[PDB]
Amino acid sequence: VGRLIYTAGGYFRQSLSYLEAYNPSNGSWLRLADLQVPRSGLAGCVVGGLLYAVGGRNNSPDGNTDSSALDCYNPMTNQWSPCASMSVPRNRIGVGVIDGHIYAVGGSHGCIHHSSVERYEPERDEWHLVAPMLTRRIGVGVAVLNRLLYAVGGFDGTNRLNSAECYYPERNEWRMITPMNTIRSGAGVCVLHNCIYAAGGYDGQDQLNSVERYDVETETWTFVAPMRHHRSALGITVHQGKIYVLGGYDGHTFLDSVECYDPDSDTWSEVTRMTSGRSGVGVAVTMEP
Numbered sequence: 001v002g003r004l005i006y007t008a009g010g011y012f013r014q015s016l017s018y019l020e021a022y023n024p025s026n027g028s029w030l031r032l033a034d035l036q037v038p039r040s041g042l043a044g045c046v047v048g049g050l051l052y053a054v055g056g057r058n059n060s061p062d063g064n065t066d067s068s069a070l071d072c073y074n075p076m077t078n079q080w081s082p083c084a085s086m087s088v089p090r091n092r093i094g095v096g097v098i099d100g101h102i103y104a105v106g107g108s109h110g111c112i113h114h115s116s117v118e119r120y121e122p123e124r125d126e127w128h129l130v131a132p133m134l135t136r137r138i139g140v141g142v143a144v145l146n147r148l149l150y151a152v153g154g155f156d157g158t159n160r161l162n163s164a165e166c167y168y169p170e171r172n173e174w175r176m177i178t179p180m181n182t183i184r185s186g187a188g189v190c191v192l193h194n195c196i197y198a199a200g201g202y203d204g205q206d207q208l209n210s211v212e213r214y215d216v217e218t219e220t221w222t223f224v225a226p227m228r229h230h231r232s233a234l235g236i237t238v239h240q241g242k243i244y245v246l247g248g249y250d251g252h253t254f255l256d257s258v259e260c261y262d263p264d265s266d267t268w269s270e271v272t273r274m275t276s277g278r279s280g281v282g283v284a285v286t287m288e289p
């Protein structure tokens, strides 16, 4: 009991500093302490009950600055604290957590498209580079299942990608997995039961409502019910066995829609609206303040 869906940052006209938390048990939203620096294209994650905001870019009136930052929000204090910065700025980053360690994957720095990957140790407040991916990927979706890290889709600067790869920590090695059926960058990628889901994104021509899932045993990708709304640069998380997608861009509107996927019925429903439409958020779940 008591867990909220936290959304940090995002983009609407400029990068945003908002931190807001949704309570699925009562439909309420809380506005919490703003990020110290506005950021879009970031990722969120949780370790030890603390919320982390990783990477991104500050698109502001005065400039566009890619972020190497890691910042930590403690729901007990409603305060953000800086942590050690990454080796490199990473906008349009993907993040996953393995056994209490944060992996920062890919992303962009100016015209540079990273294949590099680094790992944060919260107790030591240190980052260290690990093996790079086999592919340069920005707008990459990342998720962790069974202590293996998956990097899904993205953009290498020339083509959006249907490819995906898996990192095996004990060997510090990446291997390609079966590619998705659809090219996607800026998809929401998460884990639910024994599958990696890729929802939405941009294929180079259109924002997508399709959703497909990779079964890590059978190595297949299967489409599930599509979302009601096409969206790229959406936030995603999982809570109590359901997927939540937040915001994004549909080619017309920065969406405020939050949809929820029930795997038992293979259906999506609209569960709430964010307080304002935005794309490029970071999202994670932890205890309420």
Ligand SMILES: O=C(COc1ccccc1)NC1CCCCC1
Binding pocket: 010, 011, 040, 041, 042, 092, 139, 185, 186, 232, 233, 249, 279, 280, 281
């Ligand atoms: O939301 C963002 C930044 O975060 C992104 C995250 C993943 C992929 C792409 C971007 N930029 C918006 C600019 C205006 C057009 C819609 C995307």
